[PDB]
Write a protein that binds this ligand. Sequence first.
Ligand SMILES: N[C@@H](CCCC[NH3+])C(=O)O
Ligand SMILES: N[C@@H](CCCC[NH3+])C(=O)O
Ligand SMILES: N[C@@H](CCCC[NH3+])C(=O)O
Ligand SMILES: N[C@@H](CCCC[NH3+])C(=O)O
Ligand SMILES: N[C@@H](CCCC[NH3+])C(=O)O
Lengths: 233, 233, 233, 233, 234
Amino acid sequence: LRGELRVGLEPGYLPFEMKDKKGNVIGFDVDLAREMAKAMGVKLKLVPTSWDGLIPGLVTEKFDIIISGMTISQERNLRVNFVEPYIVVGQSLLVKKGLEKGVKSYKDLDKPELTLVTKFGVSAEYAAKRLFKNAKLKTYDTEAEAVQEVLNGKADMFIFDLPFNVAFMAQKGQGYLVHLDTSLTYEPLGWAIKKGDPDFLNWLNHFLAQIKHDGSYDELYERWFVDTKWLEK
Amino acid sequence: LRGELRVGLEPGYLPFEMKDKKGNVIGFDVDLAREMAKAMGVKLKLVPTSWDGLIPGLVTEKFDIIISGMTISQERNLRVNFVEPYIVVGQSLLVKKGLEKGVKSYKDLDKPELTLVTKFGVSAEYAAKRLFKNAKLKTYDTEAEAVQEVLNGKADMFIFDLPFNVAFMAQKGQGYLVHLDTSLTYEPLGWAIKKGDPDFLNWLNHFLAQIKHDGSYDELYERWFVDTKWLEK
Amino acid sequence: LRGELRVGLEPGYLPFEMKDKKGNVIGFDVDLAREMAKAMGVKLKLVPTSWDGLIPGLVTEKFDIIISGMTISQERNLRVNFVEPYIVVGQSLLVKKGLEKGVKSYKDLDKPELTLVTKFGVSAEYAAKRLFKNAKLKTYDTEAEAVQEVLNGKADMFIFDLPFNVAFMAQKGQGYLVHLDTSLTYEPLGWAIKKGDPDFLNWLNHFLAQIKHDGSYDELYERWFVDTKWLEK
Amino acid sequence: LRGELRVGLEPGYLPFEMKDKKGNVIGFDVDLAREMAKAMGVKLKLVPTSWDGLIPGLVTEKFDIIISGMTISQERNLRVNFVEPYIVVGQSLLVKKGLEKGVKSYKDLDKPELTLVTKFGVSAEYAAKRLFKNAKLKTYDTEAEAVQEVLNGKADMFIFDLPFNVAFMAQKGQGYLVHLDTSLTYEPLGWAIKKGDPDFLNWLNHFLAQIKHDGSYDELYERWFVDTKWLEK
Amino acid sequence: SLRGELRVGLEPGYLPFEMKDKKGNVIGFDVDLAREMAKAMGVKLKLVPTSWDGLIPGLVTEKFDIIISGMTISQERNLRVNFVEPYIVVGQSLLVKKGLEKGVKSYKDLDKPELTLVTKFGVSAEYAAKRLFKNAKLKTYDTEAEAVQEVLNGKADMFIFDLPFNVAFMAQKGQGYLVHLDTSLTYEPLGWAIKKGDPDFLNWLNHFLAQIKHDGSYDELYERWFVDTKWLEK
Ligand SMILES: N[C@@H](CCCC[NH3+])C(=O)O
Ligand SMILES: N[C@@H](CCCC[NH3+])C(=O)O
Ligand SMILES: N[C@@H](CCCC[NH3+])C(=O)O
Ligand SMILES: N[C@@H](CCCC[NH3+])C(=O)O
Ligand SMILES: N[C@@H](CCCC[NH3+])C(=O)O
């Protein structure tokens, strides 16, 4: 690769990709992508894309790599190759205040009179249909649209990857929601690239091992997952 | 690959693959293969094959994968590729009664007046050739035939993969054989696929890493290496 | 109604209604009926009554509503109308220490030696007969008489609505018995009024949802089901 | 009410009600009445009835409830009260083998050239008028009789409640018809009772809630909507 | 469950539920609902504009069939009429004069007896403000619109009322002069009332309500009145 590293993501998975107040795209994966560019001695470009355009975009060479906090699922892994996992994740729940009472398991929210909302075409959806099966399930176009349904009284509860939930609790959720943080799925996230390229994978993996033993990774992880400065966009 | 997942294996290797009383082939690898096929959204077609016909069956494109309790050796691995190890194993023995007495190690048993038996052309035959300088070694077409040879007055001791020993011990060698259980080799077991498809490898390694963290693999480990339920066929 | 709302209950079920110290009756249900009366602009009158005279007491205008932890069952529903459920409950078991080990459902405790005990003529009794075939079962007049035999040594297990088993646990059971938390049935508890009054229902259903979105329900709930300050009765 | 529960239904709406080989009527709606009569303490008498006579059979007191896959509408609700819905269904198409190709929405089958058919005076005919402007509409006496006009030459496509179609496909259709399963409407079906009984409502509505939270509704759902045993009939 | 016409009592001037068009017909989210409901029953709509303290008794007295006036389901009222499952959920909000919102985190920063607070007489807000406000002057007026004029006039500092009123008011006149403190302070389910002893008609209404929530009808009327601004050319 010469010139520039084109990375496609979709903004809105806090704290991985979000849109600035200035409209600039920032986050863990964005910093991850600057490092990669640097370590490759090459220019970074981001291409923003909707979740559903990510894999075809990659497969079609709209970009070279995906770094969107994407679950290494066996389905998707048939269309692209995944680098090794750089963070490990699972789905928790955000609930309206009050229905959290006496819940010992997620399983007793799997009730027919309850409405569960996530975003369409994502891990949590697939989790939701595997996990629940009683509760009504509705899906939406964004993480934001979806938690709004429960915030505004339209839904009872919201499911998503755990770090979106804890980012959210910090920025808006503390007062009005409750986070049931017990993880419900084992979801490694890796970067995806298109098949037929083992040389890239070699490079990507080593470059992952480096930052994980460099102290570089742990800084970024501190920045986006423990620290709270970032929250003023 | 679309349609079906063809898996070559050779039954005989308790608890990985054997055939039941009904005539169907079942066991650890089978449940793995079934799980694998489901993850690719595909049908499963086992292709039972004699051992010597497994690699060339594979390289010959008669099936896509070996799942036979195959050992990742440097010799084989010149001919095919292996996924990361799904289980680690090692060679042990069964001796007839009275034999187990006085022994401190394998070295005590490596004597000329004794005959050692094992399946021809297999992992054990190689450790046997390496480990034992003084003892007669005679090989057979199936593990069962090899054991029989010491269930009779014919051989003194049988060597094989340790897990087969522990299962046969529970199956038939209860009163008769004695199990010296000191692992004598380091034997990593792995799925093999033909060379020059690194994408399938990527998909295989990410899948093996799921079932070790899912609980899936764990549920299946118990089933076949602890449960004792499966002895009824 | 006029002048007084008359409530029909039997003190015993904890933490719903219990008599103590001063000989006053108190609990979640009482606190509920208290808010109900302020809402109507009436004065509360509590009419403590043995279980088996609640429904007859109701049909006979001994009192106007039954708020003492009652299951909305189809048998009882033939005889009175239920407001929509105010809480959802379920059978759990208190057992002696030792009994909990390796037990992987209530079902592996259904044995002709073991003795299940309960209060007579209550939802707990009917579930006892439905689930447990083999276990000797004995019945007593109160919840206390029944758990006694278990604490003391005569019977050895106890079955009742879960909220009780945790409440007992927090007062007297913590060193002594083991609580298999798992939910054995689905048991909605509702207020019961006599038939032929759809207006009082309409009113009762709206009152229920007010306190549910009011925070009022929630306060009472913490105060009785989580708060440990009350057990100082 | 005591003695028996009389239940009015029209056989043919697979898999809710249909006449079996011997000629007794079965299905999801019968098993559901069978649960009602057990819980009610009472015997069960099914009163089969032509559809345009059910509402008048109820009001007339020919039976006590209509469980028939009846859609809840405002028109109907003027004459009879409806319990809450027990299932939500949607209208869908059964078209001749071949003319499924190209199509993207139901609208491209709305050509003056094509003949659409369904049963007379039933919520499928109304959606059909509502949704089909051009195509010639013909109405018959029974679902079975209307489809029969696509199975032979006469008509082109068939409109009815999705479960009917999934059922018809698994029973006869696979090689003959094509099923576009995009639900075109949203219709909640409900049980009807004669107006004037608020107590039977309260009963019926709690009963529906039990079985939906119990496992019994789900038993009966897998049974008729999924399993396929039922066809041997 | 009747023949002839469906008669609906309402009090115009709770924007955007009910208002006078100025050609003098009453229009609003409630009227469109009342219009849908009447069609579904195959019957005619008559609106019976009524002043607020006369809605319930008019219903009991059989002057009309149902009240669709954005009325709060309350235990005290529910004693006298029956309510249908609520159809929209609302809370009280505050409209204040310019600047007066700076450095305020909650409603509590506004209790000063210095401050004067106004609303309409005998209405959800009036009872809420008496609960919530302990120090502030509370004055009352026959109409929502007479009430806000006092803060617009600078004879009072802030207006309290159902939140959807405030946003519609902010759009028409308030945008330059007042500021909407839009934190919801009550939990106020809104339902149609009818007289007691009629379970059938309740059955009918509850199922009609479920129908328009799942139709798209409800959402449509909702957008039309509560979100988009077109309705404002009275
Ligand atoms: N990691 C999840 C979240 C998607 C985030 C959508 N912006 C997935 O792979 O679907
Ligand atoms: N790992 C042993 C197992 C052989 C089993 C023969 N059925 C090998 O590689 O030869
Ligand atoms: N839920 C129980 C109540 C416990 C009995 C209280 N003394 C029942 O309805 O049978
Ligand atoms: N669900 C529709 C169709 C039932 C068809 C009866 N054979 C209705 O309520 O009319
Ligand atoms: N929700 C308010 C409506 C105000 C009506 C004013 N015309 C109430 O029920 O009091």
